[PDB]
Amino acid sequence: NLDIIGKRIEKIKQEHETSWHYDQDHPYKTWAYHGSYETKQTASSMVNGVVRLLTKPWDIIPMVTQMAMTFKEKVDTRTQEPKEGTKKLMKITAEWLWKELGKKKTPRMCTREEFTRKVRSNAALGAIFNKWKSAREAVEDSGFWELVDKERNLHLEGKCETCVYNMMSRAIWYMWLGARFLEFEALGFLNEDHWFSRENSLSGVEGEGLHKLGYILRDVSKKEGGAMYADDTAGWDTRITLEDLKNEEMVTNHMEGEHKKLAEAIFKLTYQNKVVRVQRPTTVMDIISRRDQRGSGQVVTYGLNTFTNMEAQLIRQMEGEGVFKSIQHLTVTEEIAVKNWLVRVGRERLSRMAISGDDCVVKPLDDRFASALTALNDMGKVRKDIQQWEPSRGWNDWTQVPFCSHHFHELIMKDGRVLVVPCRNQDELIGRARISQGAGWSLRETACLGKSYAQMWSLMYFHRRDLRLAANAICSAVPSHWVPTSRTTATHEWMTTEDMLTVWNRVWIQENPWMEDKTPVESWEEIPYLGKREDQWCGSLIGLTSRATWAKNIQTAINQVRSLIGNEEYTDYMPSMKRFRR
Ligand SMILES: [Zn+2]
Ligand SMILES: [Zn+2]
């Protein structure tokens, strides 16, 4: 409590002394309340006109149109403390997992130089506006770094002054750029040096890309065992216990010098003790604290969620294999059996999983896993959309398993070679490309975002008839040499001015470890589609009157957009298709 959060609270109280008041009608039960002060202010989703003008048939599909119109009673719930047996299982497993992750890696501090480059190339670090306008301006002004140094030396002392969260199935907690830097210095190595790559972590997929995930699921499917299980958790970030935050901190045991102390401080002072400011309309600013749940930076959140999720799923596996009998209490001989399992088969059991933060696919040794629920429920990782004690429903086919919002098809080229391609309902893909976030978008910038989406569709979704055609139309409608842009930046190989057929060959043939024959593809017509009936199942409008009219008359839609943008240098990409090729 207050000897760690006090100083932070004291400092804010004073800056709004003319507004302070301990409000008695406060809507908090599970958060600790501290006081309120006067504020008044709020960002909605705008339509990309370039993409909408080249996707007319979809102007009458509600699933697409509604996406562009528009829980904080789940952040106010309290997780129970686990049993002693559960806590023992978690500490042993965490201890062992950090050793394994650390066998071929060296913890190290990230640098101002490294941080500066990040900001000067638009990564979404989640900072606030005020003294300097943007992030960019603050990074050259030596004043900033004197503030950063004040807080830094404070953290070495073991106290905090300026590290305070701002809260705006999602909940995003911005800090000021300074506190983001100090988080990056101490914990950035996890992302920057790829601790959760598949090579290093065996379960993880950090930096793999959407064109590898299908191949990774199929490799898992090849192992002997039961169904593939893919249970989603209900509000994962709100079910992170203090015991979870403590096992995460054991990464510091692998550190030394300044680093160990700086990392210890972030975990102690910001993660395991939180100070947050929230807008309430009855408008005031509420200064609340609590000890548990997740609210770090989105990139460190990712890596820590993967770590804790790896830990939970190895434990659920142990329960299915009958390594321990009850969560109430671990005997002495059970501790040695758990430790022996991890040493004998742990690495093999990690390779049976694909884990991306809160998202997992598990192919266990057999189907006992399905009704092994006691550890999972007691750790607080309650399954979404199924009764607490009802057994999990597994999948019998790797092409039906959901993972990172996709499913994966197996697709045979005319030359016999095999692609594994990502897919989702086509209304979701078209609906997202019609949306832009923010204000002050020039026509040129709107066009360049449209082009980023088209290049993505050509590289990942080439097998959907409607998306190859819409992609060709957009790349024809936007000046050939204008560079694809994005304001909120996995592997993004479509962000480039290089020839898209040359990128396709590098990604799917040259650099693809699942493809033995390296024979380049000479044109887009060598590159196959899903079956027509499969394309309709995944949402294609192939076979409708509206869709045939759009395709027939596509050069008229292309010319409409060219007339609005003006007299520039354009390329016709539509003769790359068979039906437009004379
Ligand atoms: Zn601090
Ligand atoms: Zn599909």
Residue 94: Cβ-neighbour burial (10 angstroms; 0-12, 13-18, 19+) = buried
Which single residue is written with the structure tokens 């909408």?
Answer: 52
**Assign residue 310 a region: left if phi > 0, alpha if psi is -120 to 50, beta otherwise?**
alpha
Dihedrals φ, ψ of 279, to 5°? -75, 130
Cross-strand partners of 280: 284
Residue 269 CA to ligand 1 centre (angstroms): 7
Residue 295 CA to ligand 1 centre (angstroms): 15
| The dihedral sign for the CA sequence 510, 516, 518, 519 | negative
Instruction: Please state whether beta strands 407-412 and 165-167 pair in parallel, antiparallel, or not at all (unpaired).
Output: unpaired
The token pair at 208 is: 């793999």
Per-residue CA distances from 97 to 32, 332, 380, 491 (Å): 34, 21, 20, 26
| The dihedral sign for the CA sequence 346, 351, 355, 359 | negative
All structural domains of the chain with their residue ranges: 85-101+197-232+297-402, 404-576
Q: How was this structure determined?
A: X-ray
The token pair at 393 is: 């429903």
Nearest alpha carbon to residue 223 among 361, 95, 429: 361
User: Cα separation of 300 and 121, whole Å?
Assistant: 19
DSSP line for 99-160: HHHTTT-------HHHHHHHHTTT----B----SSSHHHHHH-HHHHHHHHHHHHHHHHT--
- Angle between the N-to-C axes of helices 545-552 and 554-565, in degrees from 0 to 180, rounded to the nearest 10: 60
302 CA to centre of own chain: 6
Residue 456: DSSP 8-state: H
| The dihedral sign for the CA sequence 533, 534, 540, 542 | negative
Residue 520 CA to ligand 2 centre (angstroms): 26
The token pair at 335 is: 């501790």
63 CA to centre of own chain: 24
Residue 19: Cβ-neighbour burial (10 angstroms; 0-12, 13-18, 19+) = middle
Residue 452 CA to ligand 2 centre (angstroms): 22
What is the CA angle 324-272-204, rounded to 5? Answer: 55
| The dihedral sign for the CA sequence 246, 249, 254, 258 | negative
Instruction: Please state whether beta strands 165-167 and 274-280 pair in parallel, antiparallel, or not at all (unpaired).
Output: parallel
Do the Cβ atoms of 127 and 174 come closer than 8 Å?
Answer: yes
Which single residue is written with the structure tokens 């399992």?
Answer: 341
Residue 247, CB-side half-sphere exposure with 13 Å CA sphere: 28
Dihedrals φ, ψ of 232, to 5°? -80, 140
Nearest alpha carbon to residue 251 among 268, 269, 263: 263
Nearest alpha carbon to residue 422 among 411, 431, 435, 430: 411
Per-residue CA distances from 520 to 306, 415, 513, 523 (Å): 37, 12, 15, 9
User: Which residues, other chains included, contact 571 with Cβ-Cβ below 8 Å and sequence gap of 6+?
Assistant: 475, 476, 480
Do the Cβ atoms of 565 and 442 come closer than 8 Å?
Answer: no
Do the Cβ atoms of 381 and 312 come closer than 8 Å?
Answer: yes
Resolution of the solved structure (Å): 2.2
State yes or no: 358 annotated in a binding site: yes
State yes or no: 232 annotated in a binding site: yes
The token pair at 176 is: 């000021």
Letter for the amino acid at 122?
A: N
- Using a CB cutoff of 5 Å, list residues around ligand 2, an ion: 423, 538
Domain 85-101+197-232+297-402, second-level architecture:
2-Layer Sandwich (3.30)
Nearest bound ligand to the CA of residue 268: 1
Coil, helix or strand for 354?
strand
User: Cα separation of 116 and 138, whole Å?
Assistant: 10
Per-residue CA distances from 198 to 201, 306, 351, 364 (Å): 5, 12, 9, 18
Nearest bound ligand to the CA of residue 154: 1
The token pair at 487 is: 């304001």
Cross-strand partners of 276: 165, 288
User: Which residues, other chains included, contact 487 with Cβ-Cβ below 8 Å and sequence gap of 6+?
Assistant: 122, 437, 438
Residue 577 CA to ligand 2 centre (angstroms): 22
